[PDB]
Design a binder for this molecule. Structure first.
Ligand SMILES: Nc1ncnc2c1ncn2[C@@H]1O[C@H](COP(=O)(O)OP(=O)(O)NP(=O)(O)O)[C@@H](O)[C@H]1O
Ligand SMILES: Nc1ncnc2c1ncn2[C@@H]1O[C@H](COP(=O)(O)OP(=O)(O)NP(=O)(O)O)[C@@H](O)[C@H]1O
Ligand SMILES: N[C@@H](CCO)C(=O)O
Ligand SMILES: N[C@@H](CCO)C(=O)O
Lengths: 296, 296
């Protein structure tokens, strides 16, 4: 009959973890309901008028069709989506719809697929919306916590639960940034030295999570000199904001391909950091690490 | 009066951890004795006739002088070295002398320096022998276990003890490879895709150690396509050996800049893997993860 889920926004890259790291947020999230229908068609309703309802264009339809065909399911589905945040915000909006749909289809048709497989299916949605089957936003959307996409073909995802408090502040600019473009402006090659820096800093972030060291995690997160300095120039006041909250956060960086900004405020300055972000971007939210798609 | 230590060989890079990762071996090692002397000169005796006795050229003399001057120590030292393995073997031979000396000087003159500082001093020895103040061999020589050099200026080293059994086989070709040259032949730039691969795989190796997963650790270790395929062409029969021990090891790769080869054999095939390595290289040894410089 029907399955309804909340599918969370996620923050990919986290600086030196470009195309690998992902952190699941508790909010915002999409509320997605999938209902099996007799007609073998996929019908989509979405509250954001800028998101297509064509099932071959909305990632929810792309993922549902792939799963329905792969399991010879003989039904269609009506998918209703209420968006947590607009597309192109750097908060994994489309990944929320892809992952929420994969999860919902799995439940609705009792496919008993494991999390890795759900991420793999959701990534077919990311293929379409970004032109690349990247799984770094759909992985945390499904697994919750912190994930690392460590291989493709075949997809491998390593998950590290965050079992300690990690306050998150997200500033969401009203402008949007197209991920494909955000990737084209990136260097085609990086110096051996950046390879070494990013590998060391990203490994240090993994060590930091196992040691529950927010300070180390946040500081290493801000050491990327390859991607973040580039995308950061697309975001109004981004560098000014970083300087203004400098000693009041464990770290702050671009969420995904931007323009949203993700900050991990120190407990002592959370209200103040939130007020600073809000002065620049009215749409600022306080959240924490989420647990992934779940029924609602 | 005198301090004598065993300073271990170490295996740097471990594939995707190039210039970051280091693993301390239990053997071979240098046996180094440092004796305070009244004359303010540094005298060096070494059993390998191809290693200089000039204190400005032997890394033990370079490190001792730096420490003696930095602490206004008013004595000279006589340093006697019995080498575990020749220089240019890819087993951190010079780092063993640098680290063993830093450690010995610290003990002899009761400097009470922490491990990080000892690595920093030892790295002055690596500056001279490789033209680069790399700390990826001296870090594990001092800390023991697995280390990651995650920053320079200032040096930062993260240590992960290996508290599970990890058998190591090392094949030591009679030829030598000069590290400076081994680095010049490396690509000056790598594609974004290799950046992503190596960051993900190296982070996966860190996750693997915390999860005591030798299989994952060894498999990711063999995924570098940037440095290992290049240096591997300098080592006779290296690729043939990799294929021949393919399913009998968790992983096998080049130790440091080569030509020595480091393999982590599966428990079931250890003798067989050792015999295979020995058929190609008579000088093959079986060892395990070491604990770093210690008094002997
Ligand atoms: N259900 C959906 N939800 C959001 N976006 C969708 C959806 N279906 C299709 N799209 C399209 O996919 C693109 C954006 O997906 P979105 O997740 O916002 O990615 P982004 O622009 O790459 N930024 P990031 O949040 O970093 O992944 C736009 O072309 C959307 O119209
Ligand atoms: N006490 C010493 N022990 C070993 N080598 C020394 C020593 N003092 C000076 N050297 C010189 O330093 C160079 C090699 O140092 P070594 O650690 O074997 O480095 P490598 O050639 O870079 N390979 P790797 O094992 O990967 O670090 C040669 O030029 C040596 O003569
Ligand atoms: N890793 C992708 C994530 C997009 O959310 C990028 O930054 O291009
Ligand atoms: N990371 C260095 C180590 C040398 O032991 C290299 O491979 O050039």
């Amino acid at each position: 009959m029907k399955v309804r889920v909340k599918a969370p926004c996620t923050s990919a890259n986290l600086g030196v973890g470009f195309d690998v790291f992902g952190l699941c947020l508790k909010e915002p999230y999409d509320v997605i309901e999938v209902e099996a229908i007799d007609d073998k068609e996929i019908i989509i309703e979405v509250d954001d008028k800028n998101i297509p309802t064509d099932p071959d264009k909305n990632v929810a339809g792309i993922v549902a069709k792939k799963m329905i065909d792969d399991f010879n399911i003989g039904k269609g589905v009506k998918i209703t989506i209420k968006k947590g945040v607009k597309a192109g915000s750097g908060l994994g909006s489309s990944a929320a719809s892809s992952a929420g749909t994969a999860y919902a289809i799995n439940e609705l048709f009792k496919l008993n697929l494991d999390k890795l497989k759900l991420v793999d299916y959701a990534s077919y949605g990311e293929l379409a919306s970004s032109g690349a089957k990247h799984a770094d936003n759909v992985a945390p959307a499904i697994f919750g916590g912190f994930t690392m996409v460590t291989n493709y073909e075949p997809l491998e995802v390593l998950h590290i639960p965050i079992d300690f408090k990690l306050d998150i502040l997200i500033a969401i600019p009203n402008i949007s940034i197209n991920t494909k473009e955000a990737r084209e402006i990136l260097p085609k090659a990086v110096g051996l030295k950046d390879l070494v820096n990013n590998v060391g800093k990203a490994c240090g972030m993994v060590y930091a999570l196992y040691n529950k060291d927010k300070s180390l995690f946040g500081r290493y997160m801000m050491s990327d000199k390859v991607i973040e300095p580039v995308r950061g120039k697309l975001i109004p006041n981004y560098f000014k904001i970083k300087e203004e909250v400098k000693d009041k956060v464990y770290g702050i960086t671009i969420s995904g391909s931007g323009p949203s900004i993700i900050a991990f405020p120190k407990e002592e300055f959370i209200d103040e950091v939130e007020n600073i972000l809000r002065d620049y971007y009215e749409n600022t939210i306080r959240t924490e690490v989420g647990k992934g798609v779940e029924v609602v």
